[PDB]
């Protein structure tokens, strides 16, 4: 009860900032997560023993892939932490409980392959879940781990509160399917610009949380340039392996996944910042003004990719 987690001073200060990098000491990431839960939710939200057991089972069910790994899970949770702490009063008790957990679980048991590769390979998951194939799997893995003995971190919630938190987690994890982000953002843009956006409207809150999920998921573009750049290497390491696997099925992969077209990565980043990232953080900033630092950091990184194209690095 009187047992707080406390971090070294540099981490205590910098964890509050959007651009925080959780660092290369894997063994500190559980502690960093518990710290964020305690500050964003409270020391009372979860039984520490159940929470620690839950976190260590989640870690065990992330695979040793270049990008969609346990570090990504904790990085995405930290971005969510920063959003929630900078928007103190906008979110419910159930939302603060559910969203950090959703973020920690959102890529559970990821294999480093896209929904599209699973459908072309004809993976069993593609027959079980025809759309948002991996994201339905991630939610399924979340429920599995919640149902392990001594892993029920939500055990103090009523039946209907428990159903609501699991429904927040489900929608939040499904929203990380980037195929769904375009339409979600277009609807939020229209709603914001016609003044019809209503945070008492559950379907509106769902849309806003979905956009927070995209923002946290893509948050490598909001880090300091060296973090952003070195993260992109891990992203492409996965894409190019998928490209190799597409060539093994007799399918030319898209250029994003073809290691033979490495040279076009910089132009590929420009399209991604302009089509996906900047629009994401712009709409998020319109709805939640204190998230501006994400938009600002994303624009700084777009400017760095522009410099790469000009051979200024
Ligand atoms: C759209 N496009 C095209 C090219 C390209 C490259 C070489 C040659 C031709 C085309 N590169 C990109 C963008 C790469 N995507 C990212 O970098 C990315 C993601 C991301 O797509 N998701 C899915 C799992 C994570 C998340 N964060 N970030 C930074
Ligand atoms: Mg994912
Ligand atoms: Zn992710």
Features:
hydrolase; binds zinc ion; binds magnesium ion; Catalytic domain of cyclic nucleotide phosphodiesterase 4b2b; 313 residues; binds the ligand Cn1cc(-c2ccccc2)nc1CCNC(=O)c1c(C(=O)N2CCC2)cnn1C; phosphodiesterase; hydrolase/hydrolase inhibitor; mainly alpha
Bound molecules: the ligand Cn1cc(-c2ccccc2)nc1CCNC(=O)c1c(C(=O)N2CCC2)cnn1C, magnesium ion, zinc ion
Count of distinct structural domains? 1
Helix content: 55-70%
Biggest sheet features:
none
Q: End-to-end span in angstroms?
A: 51 Å
Pattern of helices and strands: HHHHHHHHHHHHHH
Oligomer status: monomer
The helix count comes to 14
Residue fraction in strands: under 5%
Instruction: Report the structural category.
Output: mainly alpha
Coarse morphology? globular
CATH C-level class is Mainly Alpha
Radius of gyration: 19 Å
CATH homologous superfamily (4th level) name? 3'5'-cyclic nucleotide phosphodiesterase, catalytic domain
The name of the CATH topology is: Catalytic domain of cyclic nucleotide phosphodiesterase 4b2b
| CATH structural architecture | Orthogonal Bundle
Number of strands: 0
PDB class: hydrolase/hydrolase inhibitor
Keywords: phosphodiesterase, PDE10, schizophrenia, HYDROLASE-HYDROLASE inhibitor complex
Assembly: monomeric
Entry title: CRYSTAL STRUCTURE OF HUMAN PHOSPHODIESTERASE 10 IN COMPLEX WITH n2(cc(c1ccccc1)nc2CCNC(c4c(C(=O)N3CCC3)cnn4C)=O)C, micromolar IC50=0.004013
């Amino acid at each position: 009860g009187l047992m707080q987690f406390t971090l070294p001073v540099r981490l205590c200060k910098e964890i509050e900032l959007f651009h925080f990098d959780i660092g290369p000491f894997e063994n500190m990431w559980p502690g960093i997560f518990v710290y964020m839960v305690h500050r964003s939710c409270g020391t009372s939200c979860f039984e520490l023993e159940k929470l620690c057991r839950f976190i260590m089972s989640v870690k065990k069910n992330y695979r040793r892939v270049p990008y969609h790994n346990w570090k990504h899970a904790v990085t995405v949770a930290h971005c969510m932490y920063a959003i929630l702490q900078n928007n103190h009063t906008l979110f419910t008790d159930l939302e603060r409980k559910g969203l950090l957990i959703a973020c920690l679980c959102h890529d559970l048991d990821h294999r480093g392959f896209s929904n599209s590769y699973l459908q072309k390979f004809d993976h069993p998951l593609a027959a079980l879940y025809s759309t948002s194939t991996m994201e339905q799997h991630h939610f399924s893995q979340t429920v599995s781990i919640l149902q392990l003995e001594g892993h029920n971190i939500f055990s103090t919630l009523s039946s209907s509160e428990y159903e609501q938190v699991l429904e927040i987690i489900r929608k939040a994890i499904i929203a990380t399917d980037l195929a769904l982000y375009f339409g979600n953002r277009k609807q939020l843009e229209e709603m914001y610009q016609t003044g019809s956006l209503n945070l008492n409207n559950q379907s509106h809150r769902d849309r806003v949380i979905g956009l927070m999920m995209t923002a946290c998921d893509l948050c490598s573009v909001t880090k300091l340039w060296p973090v952003t750049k070195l993260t992109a290497n891990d992203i492409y390491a996965e894409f190019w392996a998928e490209g190799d696997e597409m060539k093994k099925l007799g399918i030319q992969p898209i250029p994003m996944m073809d290691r033979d077209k490495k040279d076009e990565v910089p132009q590929g980043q420009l399209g991604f910042y302009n089509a996906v990232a900047i629009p994401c953080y712009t709409t998020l900033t319109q709805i939640l003004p204190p998230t501006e630092p994400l938009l600002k950091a994303c624009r700084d990184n777009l400017s760095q990719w522009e410099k790469v194209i000009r051979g200024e690095e």
